[PDB]
Design an enzyme around this catalytic site. Sequence first.
Site: not given
Length: 331
Positions: A64, A255, A272, A274
């Site tokens: 990530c 993360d 988002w 990751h």
Amino acid sequence: DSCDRVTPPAEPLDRMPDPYRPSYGRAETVVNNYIRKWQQVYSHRDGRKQQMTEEQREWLSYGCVGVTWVNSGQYPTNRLAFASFDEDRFKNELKNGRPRSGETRAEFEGRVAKESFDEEKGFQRAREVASVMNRALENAHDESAYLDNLKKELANGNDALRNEDARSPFYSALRNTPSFKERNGGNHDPSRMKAVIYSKHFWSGQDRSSSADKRKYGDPDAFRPAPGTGLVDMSRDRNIPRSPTSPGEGFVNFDYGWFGAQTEADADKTVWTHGNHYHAPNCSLGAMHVYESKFRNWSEGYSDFDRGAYVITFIPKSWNTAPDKVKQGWP
Ligand SMILES: [Cl-]
């Protein structure tokens, strides 16, 4: 070891990604496929799409963190970071609240502190601050104008940040961004830059010489935002994970989720990016998969983490790794 990290191979610039869609708020795809997507939609420099370079694939393969590393050009410092914490809720819960069945003092204090953060408000604050910073550079050709503009708006909003030291993470953020100082990047011209956001999820109790209890249950006093500015001091973040309690439990240190600069008014619809973990295709840990989560899927987090920072940094306008609109999946 067969679990050794691998750099994914070069993906031809014309190779299209395979289709995928979100499920209950989260889309995911193997890193090889994500590279294809990235090349199609985020790679642009001066509007010209590019192959992700060997170096960027290496970065990306770290997990990530690698998404944010690639998108910003820099290993995340997290120096400028915001969160929202309800000091009133916390102190009241400590004073008047009753620990849940079995909870020790330390467990309870850890929990109440974790629960007194509001990640939506923390992101909203970062985003608002990012927009002030962006307005401040929009027509500033030297740092000096940028700081003038910035102070004007903060003073006009009677913002606590107006009072930060000239050398603070906040005021020094722009000139401390490597790419601001490249002739290719910002060329010392604020107006050639853009504020961008990502988030780190992490563990509060990372100090080897405090109680075992804090390492296990959380340090309520660590990584609390300054109530006025909402700034979090990340200086004590040492990328140390939560220590285990239960027999088979392991925790990872962090993360990282990349937001960029999406214009979407509804925070909940922001995407988002990751991922699961570093690229381990030769072992049962498996290939890296990239996750594209709606905000709430991101913000939900994991048992590993009792803290969330919303970080601001800067990239050149000429890039396209923080576009106005981000789509989950493909097409
Ligand atoms: Cl691979």
